[PDB]
Assembly symmetry: D2
Homo-oligomer: 269 residues x 4
């Protein structure tokens, strides 16, 4: 086994992330009933609410699905974060789970600060035709001080929880409608060559703000382009009208390479 992720094959590393996301999708799924009641029937306080409501729900849902805590903390801008040990066949890996909640009226892509970017981005602006850039503001790991030695790198695992919804303003006791909770597992920096080797191959899009062409502040991530590069990295728990809880569907791919989506079992929580 290994204690240093850097001693892991890109594939093995990928499983850590895959492994981390599946757990997270269980927590959300099992929190869906309540997630929806809170998201929809919480006060209005003049817009902005949803921003909070998202991070709030994402935490009330994941804090109960955690693992072996590590005695190290850090303040950052990512609405949710826990340093911990993550049991794995590749070895008990020290990990830093970073996850940010988002609320949007859109169902494809979402914006992010340099401080949320797992890897160095580089895409090509449609109109412009020129290359845009953004260094990653998120570290690859957080060195931990061994007791029997020195620093041990706790890997950084990035996850995004997008709450796609629609305004309704306010009916009886409902002010809006949660439609689906999308979940994304953004690949680690070490995996750059795979998901973003050059500007003509990448799930990153044009920022949303004044500047365009060359280096930029903001950026985007398009769900479709990510899924196509790897199906399990785009999870989606959708609310039909048959269940109070979302539709427990998990996207992956069989051992023939065909992307498949299966329905899993969840508990009352």
């Amino acid at each position: 086994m290994h204690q240093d992720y850097r001693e892991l094959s890109l594939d093995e590393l990928e499983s850590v992330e895959k492994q981390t996301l599946r757990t997270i999708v269980q927590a959300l799924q099992q929190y869906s009933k309540e997630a929806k009641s809170i998201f929809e029937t919480t006060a209005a306080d003049s817009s902005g609410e949803v921003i909070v409501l998202a991070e709030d729900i994402t935490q009330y849902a994941l804090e109960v699905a955690e693992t072996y805590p590590i005695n190290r903390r850090f303040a950052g801008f990512i609405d949710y974060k826990r340093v911990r040990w993550l049991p794995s066949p590749h070895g008990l890996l020290p990990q830093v789970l970073l996850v940010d909640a988002k609320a949007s009226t859109e169902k494809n892509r979402d914006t992010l600060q340099r401080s949320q970017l797992p890897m160095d981005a580089e895409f090509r602006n449609t109109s412009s035709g020129e290359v845009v850039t953004m260094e990653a503001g998120v570290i690859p790991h957080l060195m931990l001080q061994s007791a029997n030695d020195g620093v041990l790198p706790a890997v950084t695992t990035s996850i995004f929880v997008h709450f796609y919804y629609r305004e309704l303003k306010d009916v009886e006791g409902r002010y809006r409608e949660l439609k689906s909770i999308y979940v994304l597992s953004l690949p680690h920096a070490r995996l750059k060559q795979r998901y973003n080797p050059d500007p003509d191959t990448s799930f990153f899009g044009a920022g949303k703000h004044s500047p365009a062409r060359g280096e930029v502040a903001r950026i985007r991530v398009y769900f479709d382009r990510l899924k196509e590069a790897c199906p399990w990295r785009l999870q989606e728990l959708h609310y039909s009208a048959d269940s109070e809880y979302t539709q427990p569907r998990w996207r992956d791919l069989n051992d023939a390479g065909h992307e498949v989506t299966k329905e899993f079992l969840f508990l009352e929580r």
Copy 2:
């Protein structure tokens, strides 16, 4: 990626047991210092005090290294037990962790009531020369009620924390010496053929019970055989004089199959 353990290949099942052990071994290691202090300096009361010190030190070391808790509890003679979700590449598997603490003066073998026996056992009693047979008393899985369908089987994982020590003529604040902590990982039933195909092929042995006095019968497991059966299923956190913590050693079985050992990193806790 599998929720039902039965859908797992045999090697994989092994894998969740091994990642389960590695996590417990770590939890113990990071507590071995306090473990020593509590085990050697705790005042003996009506003797048999080694009993409860083993149970207690075990709970404390592990209760801090748990994972995604599932809302189901047990009530039995098992020392430490928790139902929960165990994340892993093979899927987020529901699991009943069963750890039994043992205060022992012998660094070889270990005793088991039948309710602690994972698989159906069969061995050849040397003294008598015959053949002994014990039926596993531990359920393969505990069924959970699915919030959205059938029942979900919770794998049963058996671990044994064996505290090797020796009494001592009180000197300092010490009353006895904790030589080392052995952590055993007994294989789940589905593995029966790989570890106990026939009577002569097993790691079991005569039980510490007295048939003459007509006692119900128990069975034993012998570290040496167990280790040969599978290196990682027998771990030993040995206390030395270099540090106050057990020496951080973990044995695995080389990429090619030969037994190997390594020193690992651990945090102060």
Copy 3:
């Protein structure tokens, strides 16, 4: 507002014990349903199974109702134990909660090893007619190392969860009936004069031990006397047929001093 319990008036000390009991009573109440299910339907193994079911059900009910944890653990024959901070008007007091579980067939009195005895006891053995004397085996407080000075005494609070039941001829999935749960709050030493000033004035009595066979000696406490000594120190969660939960009753002693009982509210858990 006081950190050292010794600086507390006698009435106040009582107060932290009573608020400690009320919290445990609630924790139990909200678990009485599962408590019943586990206690009556759990398959008997080598009998004496009522023992571990009492311990287990107790831990589960209370382990969920704790407070500000302090970084210090015990190792002894006490069933449930946690060092911690207990908030209150009288100050944030450090405290060693000591709860012992008992599986009993009698709704009167309760047995105590000496290591469970809070104060020095003295009573008048009726059969012999003489006078019996037992020295408390429970420390008044556990000293903690101050990060900024001296040591800080952690009050010792003794609670007893007594499970009253009767065996039964297996019928449904039932093997025995849990009639009710009695929760006792024994007073801390500093209260000795108020509860056991002289031998004839006490709530103790002969111990369940056999002196003839030369057994070490234990002592008993008799609910009836205890209750008269102080109403709230004896609580009873009785199981009825109206609901699956114990009937939510809590007895206190009226503003003027007369005993009073009330039905309280509890959550589903």
Copy 4:
């Protein structure tokens, strides 16, 4: 005892709040060493950081000093919040602990949204000479659904953690300096007549933004005016240069009415 705060005398209610704050001051004090290292040596990310860093530290400090959790949650704008049972001599009270972190360059007063206002405010604008108003956006309680009945009111307890600091921009590995962590316990709505009976008696000040005279959006709270109306409601843990941790000082008043400040004991945490 009582389960409904509304059955409590304003004084008793005040003790709940007093009791809640003292615990919180212990958590912060015991987190001071780390609180400071994080606050000061965390990245710059171009201002705003401190805003986050404050709530972050306030949570890493308090989440470990919690009590008996209640199975109810709610998303709001207050950076920290937990519904729970709070042991008290007045009875086990269901409580909703609301606490907001703030970071400021000032050491007196701090701004707040209607959504952070515990009680209806009303002061008199200096210049203007006219009365200003603001309804309280924070509810007095959150009804909980009894299992054996109906709604049970979980009291709302408001607390403010102001991290007074000073910019330094960036030296070696320090970018700013935390000087003191002030803590405030804002009185419940039921206590309005006491701390704010009319506009000429109140710790509230003029908002900070365009509008002035008559009803307003924002508002202020001046530490001095609050302390003078009640000494324990203004706690301050200050960093001198003798200790890594703040100066463990608690402000209260003896049972002669003289405000006194004492030094308490804290653990390593």
